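In practice, a research group might receive sequence data for several interacting partners and want a quick structural hypothesis before committing to experiments. The following worked case mirrors that situation: the sequences arrive first, and a predicted assembly follows.
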Amino acid sequence: VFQEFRQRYEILAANAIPKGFMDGKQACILMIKALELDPNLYRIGQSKIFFRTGVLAHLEEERDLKITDVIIAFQAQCRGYLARKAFAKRQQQLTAMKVIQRNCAAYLKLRNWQWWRLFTKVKPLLQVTRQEEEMQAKDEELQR
Amino acid sequence: MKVIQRNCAAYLKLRNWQWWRLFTKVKPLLQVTRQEEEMQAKDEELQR
Amino acid sequence: QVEEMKTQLEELEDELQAAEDAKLRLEVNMQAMKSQFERDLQARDEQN
Amino acid sequence: QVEEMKTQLEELEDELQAAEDAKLRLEVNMQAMKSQFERDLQARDEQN
Amino acid sequence: FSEEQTAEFKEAFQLFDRTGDGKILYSQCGDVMRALGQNPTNAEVMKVLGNPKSDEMNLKTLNFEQFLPMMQTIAKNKDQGCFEDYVEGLRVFDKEGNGTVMGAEIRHVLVTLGEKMTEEEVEQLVAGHEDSNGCINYEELVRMVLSG
Amino acid sequence: FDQSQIQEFKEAFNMIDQNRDGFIDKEDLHDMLASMGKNPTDEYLEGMMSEAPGPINFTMFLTMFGEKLNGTDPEDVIRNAFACFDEEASGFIHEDHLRELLTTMGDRFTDEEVDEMYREAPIDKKGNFNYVEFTRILKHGAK
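A structural hypothesis for the assembly, expressed as tokens:
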């Protein structure tokens, strides 16, 4: 159809086309006139346009050879955006990791000290604070 | 019917024991409140 | 001057101990706040 | 010599104390800002 | 340039070191450069990377010393593709000019045009902005990428 | 310094100080482990009394467990850092994943860490590791 092809391929030569969009049929007529294509290679129509074989490939390539600039530009920009986003994510993960790291390294330093088995055998005995905190935790859990 | 014997014998031989009586005194004296009310509220909420 | 140098060393050791305690507490608080806020954002996203 | 050493130590102590006070103030401010941001994130999660 | 931001530069450089000394792979250092706002195409990267090959890029790392002239050459670009470029090109890339752009076509023409990227790259790029119409508002995402 | 930690330490101490003198002696831990099981060899007791400047007093072991412990973090922030660490948020990351990340996370880590972790963690039969209870064990929830 007129408007589809027009808005899709006017990138090739939109030099002097009036920005006020005239009749879509007339608009594509003038745009292909500017495109300098032989009439027999296509079929002008009252509602749609018809084309030969392989001509779209020529038009596709002519279109493709103009978009690469935008292609590579936005590609670099989006790649850098993803890069900085993943960078912030990984550095936050690394901060959390350093916290976990300090903790487990302290555990390493302490998992083997003899006092540990001793004073850990006794902790499960006294639980008055544990009893109370579990009472309130079960209260809110039962309410939920 | 051979597990009830341990329970009844224990309750009998401790009922006369004055130390078991002291224990069964001090718990209602000042100990039943916190833990007993906690467990009672837990059981009530669980049943609900 | 010997007494003054002793007092100065005492004040310096006191200030250094206070600064070390404050720095340890501040690092702990910063790490805790960061981790907790990140985990809360993650849990909120999971709940959404 | 001892007086010069004590003066150097006092200058170093004053400088380190000023630096540690600035660092502790910055860390307390950052912790407060993090707590406020976490509360705001919780409120925003509830609103969401 | 200046030591003004070189402190942040140093901490970021050593932040992504797999050896923890100041030697970071060529792919990785380009990724850091892109994360530093300066996000050029890998073409000019290799151009200023001594024109190496993929093997050298994945085996040879870089010190922080040569990293300064490297971002210097990167700063010689002094500009990249503009915002009006992206908005008008995406607007004219759609089929009907309906304020949006279809998704699958964007994914395809992104992974299969010019600079090649994996599918999950553009996937997590477009992720979150999807809609039942499949036509995402290119404007919000492009301004998010530009500002972000 | 933490209120909960200091209160539970002094609680366990006044429970183990069977003489209530504030001075921990061989009698206390000896009879405690005897009631628990095999009595401790007195050389172990002397080595445990070698850190303190004498009969372990209250502030003595207070300071010793402080200097041996000050620097860690409670399980809350541990599992907080663990939460965003996993996208599934169920706490079931893989242990070999933990290995491949520990080797270079921040500073480089060796093999003793990972082998000790695997030999002292309830890992599943393919690598998946759960920390919802393991981290609490690290803060002495069960061990």
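Before designing any experiment, note the following. The CA atoms of residues 7 and 38 of chain C lie 46 Å apart. The helical segments of chain C are 2-47.
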